[PDB]
Amino acid sequence: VESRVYAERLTTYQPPGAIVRNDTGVEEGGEIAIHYDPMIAKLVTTRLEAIEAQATALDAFAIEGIRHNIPFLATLMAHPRAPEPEGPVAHRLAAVAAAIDHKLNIRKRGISGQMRDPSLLTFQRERVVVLSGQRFNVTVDPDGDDLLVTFDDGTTAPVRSAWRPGAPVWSGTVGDQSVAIQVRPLLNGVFLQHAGAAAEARVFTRREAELADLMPVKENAGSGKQLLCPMPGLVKQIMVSEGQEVKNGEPLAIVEAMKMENVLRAERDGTISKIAAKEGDSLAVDAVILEF
Amino acid sequence: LEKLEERRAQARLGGGEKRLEAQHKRGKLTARERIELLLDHGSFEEFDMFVQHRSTDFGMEKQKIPGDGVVTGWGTVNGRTVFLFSKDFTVFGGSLSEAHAAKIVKVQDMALKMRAPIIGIFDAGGARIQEGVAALGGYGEVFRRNVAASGVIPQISVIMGPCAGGDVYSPAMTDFIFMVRDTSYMFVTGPDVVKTVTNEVVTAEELGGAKVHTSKSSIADGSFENDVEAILQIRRLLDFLPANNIEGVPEIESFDDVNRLDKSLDTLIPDNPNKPYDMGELIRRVVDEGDFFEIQAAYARNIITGFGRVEGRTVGFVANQPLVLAGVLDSDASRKAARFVRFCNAFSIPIVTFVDVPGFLPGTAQEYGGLIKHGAKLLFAYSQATVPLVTIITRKAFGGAYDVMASKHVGADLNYAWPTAQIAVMGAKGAVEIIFRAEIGDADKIAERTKEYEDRFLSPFVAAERGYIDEVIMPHSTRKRIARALGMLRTKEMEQPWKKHDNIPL
Amino acid sequence: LEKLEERRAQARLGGGEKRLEAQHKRGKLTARERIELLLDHGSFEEFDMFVQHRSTDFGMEKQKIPGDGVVTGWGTVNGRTVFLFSKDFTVFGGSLSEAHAAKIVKVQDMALKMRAPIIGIFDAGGARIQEGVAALGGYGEVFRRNVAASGVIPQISVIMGPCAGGDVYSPAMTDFIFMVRDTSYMFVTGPDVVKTVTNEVVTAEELGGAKVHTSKSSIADGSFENDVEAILQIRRLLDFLPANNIEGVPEIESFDDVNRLDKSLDTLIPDNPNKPYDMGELIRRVVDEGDFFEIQAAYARNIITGFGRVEGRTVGFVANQPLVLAGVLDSDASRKAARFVRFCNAFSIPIVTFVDVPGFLPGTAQEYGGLIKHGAKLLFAYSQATVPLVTIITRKAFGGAYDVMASKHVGADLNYAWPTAQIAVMGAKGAVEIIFRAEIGDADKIAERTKEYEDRFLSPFVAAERGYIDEVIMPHSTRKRIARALGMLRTKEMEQPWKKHDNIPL
Amino acid sequence: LEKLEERRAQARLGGGEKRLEAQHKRGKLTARERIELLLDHGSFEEFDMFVQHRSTDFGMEKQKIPGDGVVTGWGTVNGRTVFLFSKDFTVFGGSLSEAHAAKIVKVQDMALKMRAPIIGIFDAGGARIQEGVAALGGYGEVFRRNVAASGVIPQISVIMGPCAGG
Ligand SMILES: CC(C)(COP(=O)(O)OP(=O)(O)OC[C@H]1O[C@@H](n2cnc3c(N)ncnc32)[C@H](O)[C@@H]1OP(=O)(O)O)[C@@H](O)C(=O)NCCC(=O)NCCS
Ligand SMILES: *C(=O)CCCC[C@@H]1SC[C@@H]2NC(=O)N[C@@H]21
Ligand SMILES: *C(=O)CCCC[C@@H]1SC[C@@H]2NC(=O)N[C@@H]21
């Protein structure tokens, strides 16, 4: 079986009984060239082990700077033929989400200039790892390189890998089940993708988790219904029609102000009624270009 | 004696159960919860739990609540000592009586004596009217101490609720102000006086809310979604900062390799001279693990400033940002960079600068706003500093701007340049128009002269031939060079004359 | 030899007799005439008369004019040594090339080493394009030296003609900028570029003329009718200033008497609390002989700042001005007073303050304009100062403002008060409306409460009872007391900890 | 970019293949070989590779060779930082001009600021006559820095060829 990764600028592109081989279309530092077709790469390797190795290699595959389509492939391969982690995968994710924290903490307890040797302080073996809506009461314990992450009811899973923060692909073994997960940094916690699923995991101690609940669930409003022009410039190109729809963050128009290109971006999942501008017209601050 | 335990349990209750419930309902934590969450487990030592106010006018003598509305003490964060005080909204609205100020001054004085940081958490309700002129005295003392410590120990402030009246002047004199997004605001005068004087009707949030102060006024250095986020991020930040102006920056063992190359950088700069790129990507590609703590992220985005780590040491980064307003220097960006550089120099943190600047912002509005002095501020900041300075000229440096931004002549130690650099007195078209003015009639000839000037003079090599550039480097090696350079630069020691203080253009 | 005399006379002609007559026709003097007029008769010693330029590109090698566009040297003013340079508009438009720059840097270095003032007269026309990148190098070195000397020697700048381009930064970092009323202007970018980029069409005078920079932007410290008046006033001012930061202020023999009484002051403050009074009369009545050198006279007129003499010694004066905006504090006045106090303190000049302030100016415009930090600047400058401070509270101080204006709490040495002083947290009406809020319906009872509060608390005697006021004096004795107090305070000696430099808000 | 690598290769060649072979025929090493042999492997960082002289007299404007006859930079010896400069006999006989002097003064100043040793390797031929009084100026500045550094950082000199004149 062979995976045909498709694109549907590249900041990072770090491709990976199984023997695989990749055929690379574009290398790192390339662009999305409107001339040719959309295509990125090909990756090739019994039916069962084959599909499993394809899954794990897919997960290993790292792409950043654009909106690639690998999640779709991973999901539609997951089916027997975005969700939230569940029974088999949620625990496997929580384990890693705790081990990463433990590693960062062991390295962060070596800061210089302390007042009394930190060895006398004793770690806390209880922790509450919180996924995007779930909750798990983990008890971590250092016994060798591998850790022993005991759950509540009694299920244990010794995490064991050699991932150093910065490397955008965690890869190791949890409960003798080889695993490749993609991590991204966040504000307080990490961003994980293992199967088709994705999650934003945070990890707290008991009291802090007892505290966080008090905080209210902040809400997100909307913008207006016009694409206001925030730069006193000279319009260069409107690259959309009147009757199309646009998803959040997509380029709509492009102007020139200080002889440097500036691109506009929509903000709501709504179709576009009537342009309030035109090619080459001059705009000062607060000038309507679109009417959502 | 159990009586002391009883008294303690009654003091830890602030101003009543019901006011605490009202506090939790607005989404805010209480003073003691904040203290408990910031510090390491079990390290908090409290001072002056039982102080009381001493006024007897206007019926105040009938309600004496212990603690006078502020909680103060000291503890440890990551093993290093810190002092902190937190104002208590549930006790007379957190106002400032005489005894209140006595506690604050005691804690500030002691912190300056032991040379340790100070964290202030504000949730107050202004001046206590009943104490008349007495209250004012309190204010005064606090101010003095702040100024005495400025530049000796780092001071961090966190605004977590209303802060109105004269009180607002205390945080203003600290090194960093952080704010909570939807439940804080700062102003000198409140809406009612604004109405009575100017007939303008404005709500508190629109007058002084977090957005206004993080995007327009320059006061605040950042916002956060809620209290927990703010406190955890303050704890994270504290690990970057030195403890005082004597000891160096703290150092931790790094997980990264100091000799790695990154081929991708060879394509970052676009070939078309009018297409922009994001400097932030480069900055996050040069720090240890892609971690970068941004300062004043939402204000004056034509310049980027922040703290990162190289080889386990904190380093400050300043960079021009092409994505917004073509990266020109204006008044706001100049002020932001000047104050940040002054902080970095005061505590002996090395500085890295990435330069891509075509000039200053033209127009009548900038001149009527006093752009001259604002742009002079940054030059002053760079030129007086005595710490290592390393600069990288990625694509452009035209005119006088090329001097303010840490040029060899104003005291930078090492100046590298990528091959795409263009160092010149002004753009090709303007220069040729000025030099060959007597023929501004012709068209083909002017184009010919422009081509000749552009190929001869708009490159890094004339600058190198004059010795203003130490080395022209291939892009993909940039990180390595920095990591090596800073090493040799650790010993920079130089002497200057004796002055009371500089006379920076305010 | 006479051939040497001929070569010298040729160097004395600059760019030619025709260009000199054209310079005169505009109503301006030549560089050498200005130098001759400023310095004491027969004292001018010139450096580097024959320096020439070294460029060989764009056909510039065929015109070598000696002097290269600047006259530099040293002399004496009233017997005291001074160094100075003056740009010559007739030679390549006073442009700044490498060889030109070297003279300037030489004289700056020598002035710093011998610790004497520097006077710079600007008449330039910007960067000489033909020199390419080298030009920038020149600029850079000059900037550096300015910053090195700030706070060691007083530096004065006088703009007597066009001053476009990057060179404008060279005067901005000096202590004082004086401008001529109808022939000078300053801007970073000229009208042509403004028009091309923004489509606005403005003349040079409307963009950077003297009026704009003395009334809106805060750059200029004064304006004058013509060159002669400007130079004579600069000479006059120079006698006030200390030579360097080590010696003391100059002394002359005074014709005034320290024991004179002035009965008039008994009626200065009107009985009617709304009608205003002129503070400038009081200031001019307290100085030695009614001689007062005003700084920034035309900008932010709600505050008054200047130099006078008491008992033959220079003294700085800061005072609130009721005649404009009721004497309130705002951002502009705050910056003005803060920079001035910083200078005075840097060179060990004592300060006298006259206080009449009702609060801060309300309105959204100030909040969006950053009033918090601008106001903190002045408090900072006062509280850090280590020279004698004497304060007089003529009419009223209210709220937080009472603390920024040299309060006893922020380190003032002596605080006097006239009998009419009203020191309180705020006005009577607002205070009573806040305290007795549960009965605000009535109008008669509120008037009763207002009358009782007003009579009890709005006086200087409650503040005195707490010991915040050293003495309540009679107005007609004020001068004598000041003259005595300053006399004792000459010996002030205090010591702060060790810092590299403060972190004043910007 | 390839043009930069090529210009580097042209600056490393100094005064030409023939002069280098003649240098080896005398039994002497060239400047870059000495620098490479003294310092730890891979540690040499060079300053100011492309500097050129700025004289126009006596036709000198027709022979412009990058580097102006001196190699300067810094490196490590047993892990400790050291600064060094080495005169190059092939380029204009290793003589001393203004632009030449600027490199020496830069490296001396930096070495004094950082408080590290200085090694100087000499293979020169004296003052370049065509430069006139300017050349003297060069001499002067170098002397000054020497005197400031004495008794602050140790300074070592190695004479590996003719070193006549001033
Ligand atoms: C914003 C502000 C009003 C906080 O009050 P709030 O959000 O509206 O909520 P509340 O009205 O319930 O006030 C909280 C309580 O503390 C008291 N309080 C608040 N600020 C006070 C102060 N400066 N001095 C004395 N008491 C104060 C209030 O009387 C109130 O009484 P309560 O405990 O019985 O409830 C306050 O910070 C402020 O800015 N005040 C300035 C406005 C003014 O001119 N007077 C108000 C003081 S009464
Ligand atoms: C081409 O159209 C150039 C116009 C403006 C030049 C650029 S943008 C404005 C900046 N200011 C300046 O001096 N030049 C820069
Ligand atoms: C009476 O009309 C009261 C108006 C407000 C008094 C003035 S406004 C400016 C000062 N700020 C303040 O708080 N009070 C003063």
Nearest Cα of chain A lies from the Cα of B394 at a distance, in angstroms, of 16
List the catalytic residues of B.
Answer: 165-166, 400-401
Please state whether beta strands A147-150 and A136-142 pair in parallel, antiparallel, or not at all (unpaired).
antiparallel
Token pair listed for C441: 């319906």
Strand pairing class (D70-77; D80-87) = antiparallel
Elucidated via: cryo-EM
Tell me whether residues A165 and B33 touch, CB distance under 8 A. no
- The tokens for C495 are 């010591």
Cβ burial, residue C45 (10 Å; 0-12/13-18/19+):
exposed
Find the distance separating the first CA and the last CA of chain D, reported in whole Å.
42
Q: How far is the CA of B162 from the centre of ligand 1 (A)?
A: 10
Per-residue b or e along D49-75, where b marks 16 or more CB atoms closer than 10 Å to that residue's CB: bbbbbbbeeeebeeeebbbbbbbbbbb
C400 as an active site residue: the answer is yes
Pairs of residues, one from chain B and one from chain D, whose beta carbons lie less than 8 Å apart: 45
C-beta of B15 in contact with ligand 1 (< 6 A): no
CA gap B191, B202 in Å, rounded: 6
Q: Which tokens sit at C385?
A: 């100062």
The CA A236 to ligand 3 mean position distance, Å, reads 51
First CA to last CA distance, chain C: 59
Substitution candidate for ligand 2 out of B328, B330, B403 with most atoms within 8 A of CB: B328
The answer for C67, left when phi > 0, alpha when psi is -120 to 50, beta otherwise, is left
User: What is the number of the ligand 2 atom nearest to the C-alpha of B326?
Assistant: 8
Whether C423 and C463 have beta carbons less than 8 Å apart is answered as yes
* Rounded Cα gap, residues B172 and C373, in angstroms: 6
How far apart CA A291 and CA A250 sit, in angstroms, is 16
Of B419, B465, B484, the CB nearest to D50: B465
Which residue in chain B has the smallest CA separation from C330?
B188
Pocket probe mutation, ligand 1, options B95, B131, B186, B194, max atoms within 8 Å of Cβ: B95
* Surface-to-core class of residue C78, CB atoms within 10 Å of its CB (0-12 exposed, 13-18 middle, 19+ buried): exposed
Ligand found nearest the CA of A258? 2
Contact assessment for residue C34 and residue C160, using Cβ atoms and an 8 Å cutoff: yes
Catalytic status, residue C208:
no
C465 class by beta-carbon count within 10 Å (0-12 exposed, 13-18 middle, 19+ buried): exposed
CA distance A195 to A180: 9
The Cα angle at residue B274 between residues B272 and B278, in degrees rounded to 5 = 95
Both tokens of B89, joined, read 């909204």
CB contact under 8 A, D116 and B488: yes
B248 vs C: CB within 8 A: no
Q: Is D103 left (phi over 0), alpha (psi -120 to 50) or beta?
A: alpha
Q: B193 C-alpha to center of ligand 3: Å?
A: 7
Work out the minimum CA distance from B261 to partner chain C, whole angstroms: 32
* Integer Cα distance of A248 and C123 in angstroms: 56
Rounded Cα distance between B10 and A167, Å, is: 52
Residue C396's Cα: distance from chain center in Å?
27
Cα C428 to ligand 2 centroid, rounded to whole Å: 56
Mutate: best of B247, B255, B275, partner A, most A CBs <10 A: B255
**Is the CB of D47 inside 8 Å of chain B's CB atoms?**
yes
Query: What is the spatial distance between Cα B351 and Cα B342, in angstroms, rounded to a whole number?
Result: 11
Measure D26 CA to ligand 2 centroid, in angstroms.
58
Q: Helix, strand, or coil here: B221?
A: coil
Q: For ligand 1, atom 47, which residue shows the shortest CA distance?
A: C434
**C-alpha–C-alpha distance, residues B111 and B82, integer Å:** 8
Binding-site residues, ligand 3, Cβ < 6 A? B 189, 193, 196-197; C 328, 358-360, 362
C204 lines ligand 1 (CB under 6 A): no
The strand order across the sheet containing D118-122 reads D45-47, D70-77, D80-87, D118-122, D155-159
Half-sphere exposure of C385 (CA within 13 A, CB side): 34
How far apart are alpha carbons A154 and A156 in whole angstroms?
6
What is d(CA B457, CA C132) in angstroms, rounded to the nearest whole number? 8
Contact at CB, D50 and B464, closer than 8 angstroms: yes
Ligand nearest to the CA of B94: 1
3-state DSSP percent of chain A in helix, strand and coil, to 5: 20, 30, 50
DSSP letter (8 states) at residue B277: -
Taking CA–CA distances from A120, the nearest residue in chain B reads B79
At C209, the amino acid letter reads G
Resolution (A): 3.5
